[PDB]
XYZ file of C-alpha atoms in Angstrom:
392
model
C -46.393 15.867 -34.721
C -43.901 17.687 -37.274
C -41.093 16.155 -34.848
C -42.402 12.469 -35.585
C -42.732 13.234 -38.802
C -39.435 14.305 -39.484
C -38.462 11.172 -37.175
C -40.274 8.841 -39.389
C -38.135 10.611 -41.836
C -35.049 10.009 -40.237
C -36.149 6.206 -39.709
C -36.924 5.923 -42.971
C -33.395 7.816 -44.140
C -31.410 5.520 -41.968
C -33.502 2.465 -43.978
C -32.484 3.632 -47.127
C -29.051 3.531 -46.027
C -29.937 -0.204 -44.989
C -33.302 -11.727 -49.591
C -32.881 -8.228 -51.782
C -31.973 -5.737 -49.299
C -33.293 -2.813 -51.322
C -36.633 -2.034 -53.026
C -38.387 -4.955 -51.034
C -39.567 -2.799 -48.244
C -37.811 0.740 -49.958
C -39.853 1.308 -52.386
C -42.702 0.732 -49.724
C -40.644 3.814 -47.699
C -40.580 5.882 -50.769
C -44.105 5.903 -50.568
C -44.254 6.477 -46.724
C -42.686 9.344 -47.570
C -45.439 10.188 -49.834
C -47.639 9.264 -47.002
C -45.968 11.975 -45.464
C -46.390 14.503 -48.141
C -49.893 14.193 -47.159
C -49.349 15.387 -43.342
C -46.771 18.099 -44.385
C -49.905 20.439 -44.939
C -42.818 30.220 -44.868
C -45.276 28.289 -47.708
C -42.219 28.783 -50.022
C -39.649 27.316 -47.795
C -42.026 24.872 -47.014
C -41.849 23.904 -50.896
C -38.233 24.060 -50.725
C -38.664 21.183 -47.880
C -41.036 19.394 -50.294
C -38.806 19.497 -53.409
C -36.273 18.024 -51.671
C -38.004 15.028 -50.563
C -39.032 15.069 -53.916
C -34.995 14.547 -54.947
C -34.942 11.804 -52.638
C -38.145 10.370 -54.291
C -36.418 10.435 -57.330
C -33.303 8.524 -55.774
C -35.501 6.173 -54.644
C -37.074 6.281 -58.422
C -34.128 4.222 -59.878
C -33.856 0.294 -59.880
C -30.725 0.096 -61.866
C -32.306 3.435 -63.736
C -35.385 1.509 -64.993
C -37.705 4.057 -63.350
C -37.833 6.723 -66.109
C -40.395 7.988 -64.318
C -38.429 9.255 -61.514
C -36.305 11.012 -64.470
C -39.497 12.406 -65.165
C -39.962 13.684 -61.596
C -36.958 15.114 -61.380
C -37.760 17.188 -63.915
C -40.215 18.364 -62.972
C -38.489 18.910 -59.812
C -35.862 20.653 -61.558
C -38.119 23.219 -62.686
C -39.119 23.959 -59.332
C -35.387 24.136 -58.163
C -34.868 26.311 -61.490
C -37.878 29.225 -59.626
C -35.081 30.318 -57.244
C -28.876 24.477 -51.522
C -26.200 22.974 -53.704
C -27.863 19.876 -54.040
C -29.815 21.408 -57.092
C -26.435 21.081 -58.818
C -26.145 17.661 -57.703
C -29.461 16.745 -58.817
C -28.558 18.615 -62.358
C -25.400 16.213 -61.999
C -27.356 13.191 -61.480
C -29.535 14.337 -64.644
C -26.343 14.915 -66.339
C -25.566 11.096 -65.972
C -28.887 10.318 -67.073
C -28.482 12.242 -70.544
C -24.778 10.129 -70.307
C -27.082 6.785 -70.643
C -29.523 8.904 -73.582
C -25.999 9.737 -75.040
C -27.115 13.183 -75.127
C -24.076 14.583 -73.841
C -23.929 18.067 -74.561
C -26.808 18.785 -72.963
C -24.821 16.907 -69.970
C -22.093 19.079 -70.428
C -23.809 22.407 -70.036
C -25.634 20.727 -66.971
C -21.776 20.208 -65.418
C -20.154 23.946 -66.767
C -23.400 25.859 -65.157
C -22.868 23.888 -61.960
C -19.131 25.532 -61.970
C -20.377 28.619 -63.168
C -22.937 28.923 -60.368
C -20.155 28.007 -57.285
C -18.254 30.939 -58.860
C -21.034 32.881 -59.182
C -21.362 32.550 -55.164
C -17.801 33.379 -55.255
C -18.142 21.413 -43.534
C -17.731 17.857 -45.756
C -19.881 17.726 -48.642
C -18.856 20.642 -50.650
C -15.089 19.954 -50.498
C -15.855 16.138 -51.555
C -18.447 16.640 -54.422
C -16.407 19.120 -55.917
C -13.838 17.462 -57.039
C -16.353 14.604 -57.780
C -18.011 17.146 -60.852
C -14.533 17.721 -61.920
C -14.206 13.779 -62.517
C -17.198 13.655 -64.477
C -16.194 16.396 -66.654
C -13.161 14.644 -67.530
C -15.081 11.591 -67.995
C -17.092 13.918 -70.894
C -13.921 15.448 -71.891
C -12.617 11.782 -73.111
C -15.697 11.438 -75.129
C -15.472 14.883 -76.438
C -11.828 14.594 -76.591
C -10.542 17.926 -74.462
C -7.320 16.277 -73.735
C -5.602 19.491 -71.671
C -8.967 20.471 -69.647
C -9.424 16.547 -68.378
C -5.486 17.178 -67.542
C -5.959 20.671 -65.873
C -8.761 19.248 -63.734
C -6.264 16.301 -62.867
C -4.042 18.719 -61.243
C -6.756 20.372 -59.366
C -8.278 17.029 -58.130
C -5.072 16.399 -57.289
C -4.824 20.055 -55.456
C -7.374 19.732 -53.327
C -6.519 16.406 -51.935
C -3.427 17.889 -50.959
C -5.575 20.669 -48.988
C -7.298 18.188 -47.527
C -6.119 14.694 -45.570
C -7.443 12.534 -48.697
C -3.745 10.687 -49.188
C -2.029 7.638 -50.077
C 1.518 7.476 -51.508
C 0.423 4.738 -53.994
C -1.521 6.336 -56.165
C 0.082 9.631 -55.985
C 3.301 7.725 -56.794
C 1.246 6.356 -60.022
C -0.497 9.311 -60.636
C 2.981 11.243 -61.628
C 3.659 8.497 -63.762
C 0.671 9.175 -65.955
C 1.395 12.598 -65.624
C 4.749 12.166 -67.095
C 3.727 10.419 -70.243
C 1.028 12.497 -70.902
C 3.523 16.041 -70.731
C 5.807 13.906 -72.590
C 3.482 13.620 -75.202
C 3.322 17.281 -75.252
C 6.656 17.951 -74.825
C 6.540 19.263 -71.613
C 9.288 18.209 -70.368
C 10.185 21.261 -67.948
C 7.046 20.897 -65.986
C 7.099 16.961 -66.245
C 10.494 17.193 -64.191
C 8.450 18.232 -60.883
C 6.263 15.153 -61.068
C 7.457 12.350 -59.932
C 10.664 14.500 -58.399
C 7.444 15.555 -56.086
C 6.361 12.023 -55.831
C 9.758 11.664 -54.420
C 9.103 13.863 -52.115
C 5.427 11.692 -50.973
C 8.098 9.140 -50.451
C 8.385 9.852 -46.961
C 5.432 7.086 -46.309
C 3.897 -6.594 -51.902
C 4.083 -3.218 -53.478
C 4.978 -1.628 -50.212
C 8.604 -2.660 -51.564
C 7.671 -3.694 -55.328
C 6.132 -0.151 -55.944
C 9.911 1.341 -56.163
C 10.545 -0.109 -59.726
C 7.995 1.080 -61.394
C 9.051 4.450 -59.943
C 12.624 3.554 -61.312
C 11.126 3.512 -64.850
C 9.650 6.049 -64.818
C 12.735 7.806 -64.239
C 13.920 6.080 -66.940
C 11.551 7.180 -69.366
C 12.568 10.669 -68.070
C 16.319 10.937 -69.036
C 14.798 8.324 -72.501
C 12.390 11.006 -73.587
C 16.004 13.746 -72.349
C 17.720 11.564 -74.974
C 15.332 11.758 -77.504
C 15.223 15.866 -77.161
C 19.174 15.468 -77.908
C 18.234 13.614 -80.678
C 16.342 16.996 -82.180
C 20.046 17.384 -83.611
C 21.083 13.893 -85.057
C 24.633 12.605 -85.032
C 24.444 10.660 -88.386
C 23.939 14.140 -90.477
C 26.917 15.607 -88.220
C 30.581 15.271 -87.600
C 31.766 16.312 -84.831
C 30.447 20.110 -85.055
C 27.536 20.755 -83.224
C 25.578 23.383 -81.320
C 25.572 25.767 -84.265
C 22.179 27.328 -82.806
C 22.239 29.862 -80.403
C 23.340 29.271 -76.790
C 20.337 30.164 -74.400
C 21.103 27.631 -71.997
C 20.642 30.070 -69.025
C 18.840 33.177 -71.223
C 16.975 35.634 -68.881
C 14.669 35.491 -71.616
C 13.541 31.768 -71.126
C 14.240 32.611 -67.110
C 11.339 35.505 -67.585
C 8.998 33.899 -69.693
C 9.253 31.003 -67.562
C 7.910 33.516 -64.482
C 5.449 34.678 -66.831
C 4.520 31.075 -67.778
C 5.387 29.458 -63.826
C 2.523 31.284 -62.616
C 0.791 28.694 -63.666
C 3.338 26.161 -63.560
C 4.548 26.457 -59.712
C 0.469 25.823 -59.169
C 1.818 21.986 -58.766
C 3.759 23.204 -55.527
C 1.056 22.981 -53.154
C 3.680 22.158 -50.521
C 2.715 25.823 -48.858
C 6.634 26.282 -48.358
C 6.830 23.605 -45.850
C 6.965 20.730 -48.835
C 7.977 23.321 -51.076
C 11.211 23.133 -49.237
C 10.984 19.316 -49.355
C 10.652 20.264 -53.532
C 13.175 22.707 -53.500
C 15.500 19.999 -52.353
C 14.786 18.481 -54.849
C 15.146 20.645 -57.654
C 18.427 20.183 -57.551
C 17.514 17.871 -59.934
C 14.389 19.556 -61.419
C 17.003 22.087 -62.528
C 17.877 19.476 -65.023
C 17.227 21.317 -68.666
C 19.403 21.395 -71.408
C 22.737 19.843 -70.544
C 25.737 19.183 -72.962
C 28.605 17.642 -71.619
C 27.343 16.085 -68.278
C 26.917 12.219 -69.884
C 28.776 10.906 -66.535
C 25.993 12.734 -64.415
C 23.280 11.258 -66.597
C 24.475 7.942 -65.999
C 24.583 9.016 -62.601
C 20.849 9.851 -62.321
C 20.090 5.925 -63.663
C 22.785 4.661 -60.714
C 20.874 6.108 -58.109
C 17.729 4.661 -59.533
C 19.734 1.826 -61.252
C 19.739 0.590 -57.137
C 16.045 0.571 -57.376
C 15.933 -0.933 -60.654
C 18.274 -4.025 -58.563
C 15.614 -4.273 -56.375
C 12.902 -4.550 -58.989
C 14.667 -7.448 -60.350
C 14.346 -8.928 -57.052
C 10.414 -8.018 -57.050
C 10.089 -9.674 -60.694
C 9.892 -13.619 -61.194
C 12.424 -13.910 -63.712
C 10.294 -12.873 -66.831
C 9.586 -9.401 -66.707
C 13.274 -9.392 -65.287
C 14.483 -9.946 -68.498
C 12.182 -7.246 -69.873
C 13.400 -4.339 -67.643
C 17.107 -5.234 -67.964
C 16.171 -4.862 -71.635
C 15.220 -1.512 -71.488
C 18.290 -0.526 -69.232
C 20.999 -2.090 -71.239
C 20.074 -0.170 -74.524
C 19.312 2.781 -72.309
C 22.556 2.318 -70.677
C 24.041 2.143 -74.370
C 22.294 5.222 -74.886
C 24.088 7.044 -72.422
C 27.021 6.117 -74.258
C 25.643 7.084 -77.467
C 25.414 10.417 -76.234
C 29.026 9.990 -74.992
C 30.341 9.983 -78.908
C 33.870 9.689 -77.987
C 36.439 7.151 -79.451
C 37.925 5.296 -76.520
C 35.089 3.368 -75.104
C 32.894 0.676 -76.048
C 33.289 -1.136 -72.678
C 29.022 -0.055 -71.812
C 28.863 -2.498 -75.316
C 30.577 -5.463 -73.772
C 29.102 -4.765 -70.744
C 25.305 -5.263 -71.682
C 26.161 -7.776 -74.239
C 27.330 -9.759 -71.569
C 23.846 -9.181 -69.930
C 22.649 -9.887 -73.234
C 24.042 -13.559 -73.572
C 22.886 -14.100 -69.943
C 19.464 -13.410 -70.904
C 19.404 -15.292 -74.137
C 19.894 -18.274 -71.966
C 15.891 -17.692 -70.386
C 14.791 -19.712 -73.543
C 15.145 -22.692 -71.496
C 11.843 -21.521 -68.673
C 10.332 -20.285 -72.121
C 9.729 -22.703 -74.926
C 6.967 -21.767 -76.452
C 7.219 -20.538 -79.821
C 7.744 -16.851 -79.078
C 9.612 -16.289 -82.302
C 9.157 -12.385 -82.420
C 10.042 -12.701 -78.952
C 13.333 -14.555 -79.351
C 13.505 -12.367 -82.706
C 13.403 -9.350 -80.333
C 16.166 -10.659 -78.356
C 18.288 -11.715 -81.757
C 17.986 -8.239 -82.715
C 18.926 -7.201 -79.705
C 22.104 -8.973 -80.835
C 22.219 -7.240 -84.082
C 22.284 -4.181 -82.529
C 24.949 -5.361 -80.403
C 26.789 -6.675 -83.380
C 25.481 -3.784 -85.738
C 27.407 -1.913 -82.718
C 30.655 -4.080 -83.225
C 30.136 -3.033 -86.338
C 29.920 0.428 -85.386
C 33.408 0.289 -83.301
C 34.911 -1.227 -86.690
């Protein structure tokens, strides 16, 4: 009756997918199952059968992981696994989290870089899902153990294979860039950062269905902010009007070269397989974006078109965080015009500071004491002022 058996199996598998819905009646299949052992006496693969029932034992050996003793198990089954398919790795990963509640990760760790090691030392679902899924918990150890770029290369590659596969939703990717961003920001990789959410403009194609467009927008503008800030590597108040004394290398073969070199890895983030590379390559029009001088009028340009967005943000915001984002646009606006260090023009000043007076006027919805807040806002005025100041 090996058939019924391995129906009584099946039953009993479709149960444990099934007033406490679990354990009540589970625990009674786990040891049905063990029943079963009983029955189930080539001898080796036969074992191989056995130890994974055993696996499943263990799963059902866990009650919010109060049953040590099905840790125990699978150890032991472990060592069997360890005598000579994947789901040994799994198992190892489900150890791994076990060591993760011991707080014995490094022993966790090796469990996760030998299940790696052992796909690569091989070389239609579950593979292609639980990959990705060891990756996560590596990064998950990698925050503990502080690996900063390996939780960020595995990022990428989670984010790779979604893209071979049908996994998608324009949300998160659109979010995902924007944590992307920062974190190449933060290590001043500003040349690859450019791609990111340029290629989330690209996942454009397909509540926040309309709000989600201004948090793009500032991301963009932390993109020409943190553009800004690399002009400020030469600062203006220990200059005159000389500048650029460094070499030129604005279009060197030697950063062109080094960037193939170093693109090999780089262009890894066009998975578009041509078709959306083309989408991309639109779009590097503006990834082309480096190390510009004299192109403040584009610049501005580049917030317009996202300025627009921006507009309808302020439309998606009720009239608090308004005030908030037209902050950070009216001194990045001024910003532009910082960079702009010519004599006849201080109309951007006026301009926000009329913005500014407008918003002052928000005190009114807002009377509680926010003094830094309204401090904030004053010193947004001394700016303003310190800018009058500036003019004269």
């Amino acid at each position: 009756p090996w058939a019924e058996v391995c129906e009584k199996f099946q039953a009993a598998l479709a149960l444990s997918r099934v007033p406490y819905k679990s354990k009540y009646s589970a625990r009674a299949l786990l040891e049905e199952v063990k029943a079963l052992l009983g029955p189930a006496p080539p001898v080796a693969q036969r074992a191989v059968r056995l130890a994974v029932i055993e696996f499943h034992l263990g799963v059902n050996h866990i009650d919010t992981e109060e049953l040590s003793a099905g840790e125990e198990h699978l150890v032991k089954c472990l060592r069997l696994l360890r005598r000579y398919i994947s789901l040994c790795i799994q198992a190892q990963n489900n150890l791994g989290i076990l060591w993760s509640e011991r707080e014995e990760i490094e022993t966790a760790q090796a469990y996760l870089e030998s299940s790696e090691a052992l796909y690569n030392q091989y070389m239609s679902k579950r593979f292609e899902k639980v990959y990705t899924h060891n990756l996560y918990y590596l990064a998950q150890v990698y925050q503990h153990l502080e690996m900063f770029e390996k939780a960020a290369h595995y990022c990428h590659s989670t984010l790779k294979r979604q893209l071979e596969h049908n996994a998608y939703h324009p949300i998160e990717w659109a979010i995902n860039a924007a944590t992307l961003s920062q974190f190449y920001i933060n290590k001043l990789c500003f040349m690859e950062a450019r791609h990111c959410l340029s290629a989330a403009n690209v996942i454009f194609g397909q509540e926040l269905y309309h709000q989600r467009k201004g948090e793009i927008a500032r991301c963009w503008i932390k993109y020409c902010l943190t553009l800004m800030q690399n002009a400020q590597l030469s600062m203006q108040d220990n200059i005159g009007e000389l500048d650029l004394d460094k070499q030129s290398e604005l279009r060197a073969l030697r950063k062109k070269e080094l960037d193939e070199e170093e693109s090999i890895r780089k262009k890894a983030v066009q998975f578009g397989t041509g078709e959306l590379c083309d989408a991309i390559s639109a779009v590097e029009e503006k990834v082309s974006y480096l190390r510009p001088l004299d192109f403040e009028e584009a610049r501005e340009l580049f917030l317009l078109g996202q300025h627009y967005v921006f507009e309808a943000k302020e439309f998606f915001q009720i009239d608090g965080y308004v005030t908030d984002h037209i902050e950070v646009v009216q001194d990045h606006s001024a910003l532009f015009k910082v960079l702009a260090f010519f004599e006849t023009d201080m109309e951007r000043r006026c301009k926000m500071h009329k913005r500014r007076i407008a918003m002052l006027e928000p005190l009114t919805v807002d009377l509680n004491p926010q003094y830094y807040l309204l401090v904030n806002r004053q010193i947004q005025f001394e700016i303003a002022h310190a800018y009058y100041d500036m003019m004269d």
